[PDB]
């Protein structure tokens, strides 16, 4: 169709091979672009060796894009008879369990882009199907969840990308955070004080 | 042209009376202010010194670039008499006036003045209470019957007698009405402080045998008198001017003691908006306005429908504005008015709109138009339906028994600019009714 | 509570204001100035388009930069078609760097940005640049990728080790590059990144680059820098200038030279020897003894004049005292002489007037 | 055109205008010029009648404001004349008894520093507080100081007269300098008329001088740039040393507080920022002109 | 003027314009960054492509292969443009473009020879990249923590795709081709012209940043510029009879000169006017007088001059001695130009008669006398080094 020509000239394309050390030299390429300015956009697999352990904190992850739910295969045999199997003995419904599974992995690699407060992304997940799943996400990334995101287009959600991209640069006021996010010794001692 | 008008007026007045004109230094401080500022300059540098300075070295003072500024000062400050130029040992001397130069000295240097500003008896009045109110609806009666609206209260005959004699509000017995003219619509069309110099100057032009400068001398020193504050009762001539310019919302008057009111202090020097409105393409006009006056003028062209505190809402139709034309209201004074009294929002959206038509072709300049042009188009094409037919009076001439007499006697009528119509083929011809004494004398001879 | 809203707010703005010190600046000043001139300059989130409204603050920003530097020089580049183009070599006139920007005006931006060209012209433009002044590189970026032909590291590295500050100022979001070429030269200073947050903001971030930067503690290099003060002359007749070889009515006489220039201040042409006026000076002063702010006095003391000592406006009675004080002689002040005297003027009226 | 607003500073101090009686034979001028002021003022009142007047007296111990009088009467002109002219005259003479009885009771008081940088300071404030107040109206400066008394040091008062000038430029207020006394020529005060399109003047003889302010000091700032200013003084821009007091056309000034340095300061340190020079820098600058051997 | 005439060195001239020599060379001497060149060209039956020489050299550079290809064939078999038509309509271009190539596609023969030699290429190009990677973004390790896992095969959905016949569909290798594209842009920027534990650690959690900020107090004190004293008791008899002659009454009449003053006071100040004025008149070039081709050779001798006087002071404010040869042959010049000024002077006022010599003095005047003071410094510093 053409789109990754368009996509080639804002920012370098990296992609997840099965083999372990072409991906590896995708990540330090991924990195290096990142690092000195070019840009770039690294296509990986919810279930891939990316999101087992490797961290995109600060500039290597700003925006994350989480096309579809990553729902395993439903006509496998092997989860199949895993699934009856924890429905029999655990009570556990097989739709609930799909959910949890698909839920599980979605936030893991969301949760691959801050380390510290000072981090700042955008987390968007691309399916009808993620509307009603607020509630399966880990907690501190549902509180952060607006009751308007729910159900987002695409022009709409990338204006307030844009948005909250802009606010974020300016420079933060230190009051804002001396003793609320942020606790020196003598803030950490003052809240053994108030706490005993 | 104010100054210029006023200017003027004492320009054609004989030098034999100006002189006396400016023994009073109270005129003379208002006089020099009216001068160029190129001119007061000069005048209150050699005031100071009892000598004569050559035209030269004034020219040395003036720089190249503004040597035509000096044209101009030089002129008019000649014209007024003030700087007498004489001209002695083969140089063009100049010299100021000794009645100017003292009556001026005096006022500067706190000099016998001769009670020229007159005398305070500090017995005050309330002026926000009772002199604006008075000499405003005064002022506003007088206004309301020069729109012609009806009034309960009408003025006096001597104000009255000085609208009627002149152009100012045209009347007849036979009509039994009063309606304003082409002059009175720019003199409602002017500010307050024009609105009171043009009835001021008909005024001078109109009174009869009182001196004219005992008028002059009460004008300026009026000008010189603050709002607010009484002057015990000057001349004998001032006495029934005083009481005829309490007429004019000028003066106050208890019933001893004399109040100069808001309009005084205008006449010596000058000093949302009310009045803006807005004009759509149906020929609707909604007026941001709360005032009588402006409403008034309004009703002129305007079938106005409605009113509110705070703003007025009317339509623009044919009958009211075949009542305004048929008045003498002209369509350029009507826009004129509109864009002097044009909303912001008209004003911001025609500079958008100006902006848009300059952003797409910025090679020409077009116009800037703060109301639609179809309204334009419509008001100026409704004149021209006015103007439909064109009638002259006079008489024919035919019957000619050489072709030669018939040129002659239509060349000559041409010359003296009395034609309206000749056919040569016919030896047929019409003049005015005003060149046919000429013609008929001419065709004799 | 909506006239104590307003009062409220400008204790907080007086708040930033309120921590004042002398500290060094560096009166003499090279700036190369570069605008982004790429595809993504384009848009339209700054009517009429991003390269209009850039071009006309930077005509503003060359007009205040020379008003209050007068003895500072400045430089022009531009980033076009993934290249790096001069548009106006460093000198100390004002009208040269003007008309290079109105010509640029015209032209329609294209291409990628390339900040290593960019900078790397900046650093041969600034070599031969005297040891004591500043060297400073203003750049505007708009676009969120850099297409470079080398590493961009080794050149930020070439910066510092070359002494060069380097101000960044952003139209859309923050850029890696840019926060680290904006920290590792500048100590690790991380003010030096600014991102503009509406049209309004942009023009305060230019005007506040007119101030010159304070200078490190460790980065202290002192030195005496010989310079003229020629004394003007009036000629009956026009004579050659030694500057651009053309007939004008007359000009300043250089005192170790003769030779005689058009306009001031510039380098004499013939000795290389720096021409200033007294004035010249004498504007960047106020940076070197700057007026110390003002405190608000609190309405629970007693006031001393009803009416300002400088401009005699009869304080309002009204919450809030509508005076401050200054703590040097002691003089109250109304809100509208301080904002006069701190922005206008640089001198307490109150501190001259009181005699020792 | 426009409205003006004309800012008459006085510099009338007990210190300054005695020591100019006693060397001339004047005595008590500075009633001749404060009579010929009031001619002045009135002249300025008379020019239009929209024009506002300001006068700011800088005495021994302070600055005060004589007119407008502050909102916190005795006759010495008749009441015959003209209300505006004897409202600011009146009240002008009436501040000036008051600011003569004020000093005469604080005489005893030591004053060693001249207070006309705070008036002109004080001045310019005034001038955009007018400006700023109204809305589209003009200012001048005209600073009337009799300079027969020698001033103690002029040094301290460069910073704030420059700042006042730059200033002045900024909003287009030209400043007028009328000088009184034995010294032809004011260094700082001459730049201000210079640098701000304004007029400097100098008059040994006090009598005859509403001539002078009429003629010269009456350029309105209307009809600024289409009349040639009668000024004849010349400057040169310069600038005094700071450790040798004379002026200098070609020197050293420190980088870090540029101060100016005729010679190399002893011991290779700035002898007012206290910064130590290279020795290898400054020796470039000691070194002597290269001659063929 | 300066070189061919007057013969100044071409190395001196130089010395002053190292900047303009610069900037010109900078502006020739740097190039754009790589970028996927192959797919910013769109073929757009008839369908048309522009081509250009910038892109020709692009295509170069990101792609060896097409270079191989070009040298080898441009002079020999067919022209440039007929290379490339068959370039573009042959397989190897979709294939480096990323694109899955088509067997129904026919392709062009002779470009097709060479798609052996890609994958040797592309061989070769793997070993250029491969490189040891840090162990913190080592994926192969995790793979090979447990080299004994067994575990049911994953589905054909976590499996590179095949078709019918079981082989690779070759979607993939396009992938690995795009991939290998990135790596190579980004290694060429990394031409010839510890960590791990920095990056781990939270910068916020360490303490801010402090400014290091010098500050400087400047103390005010300098002598007063270099080239009857009245008692308190003096002074409060001033004050009594100022006060006496305010109270008792103040006299604004006597404002008025005599009249034997006043004069004297015009004339004073008319006299500054008229100066003022005669400056004022006049105070692009302004119009001159002298002829236009006169003017020319002014200017000439005018630039030259100057660019000798610029030269001189130079070398003589240099402060080293090994120019002292310089500074001789310059002042040899420095004279010959004053007799050139004189010889012009003498041709114009024999020429035009003595009119145009007074005005042509005046407009080299300011000059001549920077000339000729130039000499004499030279001379009056060299007489007393020399004795
Ligand atoms: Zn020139
Ligand atoms: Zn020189
Ligand atoms: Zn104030
Ligand atoms: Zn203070
Ligand atoms: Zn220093």
Known sequence: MGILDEVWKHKLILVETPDAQETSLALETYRKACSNGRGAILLSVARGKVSEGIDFDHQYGRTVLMIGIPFQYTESRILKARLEFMRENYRIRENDFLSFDAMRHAAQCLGRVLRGKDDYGVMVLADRRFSRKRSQLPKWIAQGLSDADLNLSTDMAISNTKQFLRTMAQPTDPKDQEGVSVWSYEDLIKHQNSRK | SLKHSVTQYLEEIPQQVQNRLYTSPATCLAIYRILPPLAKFFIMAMVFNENEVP????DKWVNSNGKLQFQNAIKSMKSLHLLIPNKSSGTLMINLNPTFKISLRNALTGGEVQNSFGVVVEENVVSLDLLDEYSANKWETILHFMVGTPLAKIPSEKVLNLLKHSKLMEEVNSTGEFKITNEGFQFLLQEINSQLWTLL??????????????????????????????????????????????????????????????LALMLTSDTIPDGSLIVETNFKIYSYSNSPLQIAVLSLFVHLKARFVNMVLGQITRESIRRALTNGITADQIIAYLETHAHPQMRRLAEEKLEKKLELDPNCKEPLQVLPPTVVDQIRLWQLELDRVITYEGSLYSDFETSQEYNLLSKYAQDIGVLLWKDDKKKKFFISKEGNSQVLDFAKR | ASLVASIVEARKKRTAKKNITPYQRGIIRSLILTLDCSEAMLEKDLRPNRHAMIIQYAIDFVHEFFDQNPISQMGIIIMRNGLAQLVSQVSGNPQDHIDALKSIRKQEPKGNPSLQNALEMARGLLLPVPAHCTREVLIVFGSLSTTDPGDIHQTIDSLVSEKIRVKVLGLSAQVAICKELCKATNYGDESFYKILLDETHLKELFNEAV???????????????????????????????????????????????????CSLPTVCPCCDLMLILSTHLARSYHHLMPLKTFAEVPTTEKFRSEDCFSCQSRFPILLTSSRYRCEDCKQEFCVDCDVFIHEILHNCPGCESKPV | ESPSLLTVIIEIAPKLWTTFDEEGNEKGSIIKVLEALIVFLNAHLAFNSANKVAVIAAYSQGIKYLYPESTSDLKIINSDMYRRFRNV???????????????????????????????????????????????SLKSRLLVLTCGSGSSKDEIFQ???????????????????????????????????????????????????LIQYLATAMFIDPSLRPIIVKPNHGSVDFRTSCYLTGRVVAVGFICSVCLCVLSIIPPGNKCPACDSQFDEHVIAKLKRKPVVPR | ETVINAGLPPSEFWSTRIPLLRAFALSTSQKVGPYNVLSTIKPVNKVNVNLSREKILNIFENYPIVKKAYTDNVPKNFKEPEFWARFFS?????????????????????????????????????DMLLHPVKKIIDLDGNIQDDPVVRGNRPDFTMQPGVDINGNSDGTVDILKGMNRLSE???????????????????????ESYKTNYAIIH???????????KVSNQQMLQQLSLVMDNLINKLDLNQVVPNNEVSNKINKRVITAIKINAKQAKHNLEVKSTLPIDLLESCRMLHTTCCEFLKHFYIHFQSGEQKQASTVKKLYNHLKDCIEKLNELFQDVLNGDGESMSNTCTAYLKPVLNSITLATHKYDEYFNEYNN
């Open chain 2, 55 to 58: 035209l030269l070295d004034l």
């Open chain 5, 218 to 228: 400047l103390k005010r004190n300098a002598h007063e510029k270099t080239t009857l």
């Open chain 4, 158 to 208: 460069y910073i704030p007269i420059m700042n006042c000038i730059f200033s002045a430029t900024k909003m287009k207020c030209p400043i007028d300098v009328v000088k009184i006394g034995g010294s032809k020529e004011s260094t700082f005060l001459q730049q201000t008329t210079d640098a701000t399109n304004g007029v400097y003047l100098h008059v040994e003889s006090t009598e005859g």
């Open chain 3, 211 to 261: 101030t010159p930067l304070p200078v490190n503690k460790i980065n202290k290099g002192f030195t005496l820098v010989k310079m003229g003060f020629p004394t003007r002359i009036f000629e009956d007749t026009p004579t050659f200038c030694s500057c651009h070889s053309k007939l004008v009515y007359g000009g300043y006489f250089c005192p170790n030279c003769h030779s005689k220039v």
């Open chain 2, 201 to 262: 100057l008909q005024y001078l032009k109109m009174i009869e045998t009182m001196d004219l400068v005992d008028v002059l001398h009460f004008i300026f020193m009026l000008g010189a008198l603050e709002v607010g504050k009484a002057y015990k009762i000057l001349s004998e001539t001032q006495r029934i001017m005083l009481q005829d310019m309490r007429d004019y919302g000028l003066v106050f008057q208890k019933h001893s003691i004399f109040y100069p009111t808001k």
């Open chain 5, 184 to 206: 190579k842009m980004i290694m060429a920027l990394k031409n010839e012209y510890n960590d791990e534990r920095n990056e781990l650690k939270i910068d916020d959690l360490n």
């Open chain 4, 89 to 135: 005259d009146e009240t002008l003479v009436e501040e000036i008894y008051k600011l003569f009885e004020l000093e005469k009771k604080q005489i005893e008081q030591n004053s060693q520093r001249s207070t006309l940088a705070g008036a002109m300071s004080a001045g310019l404030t005034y001038v955009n507080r007018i400006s700023k107040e109204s809305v």
């Open chain 5, 90 to 126: 042959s397989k190897l271009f979709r294939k480096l473009r990323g694109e899955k190539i088509m067997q129904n596609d026919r392709g062009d023969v002779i470009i097709d020879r060479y798609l052996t030699l890609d994958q040797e290429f592309d061989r070769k190009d793997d």
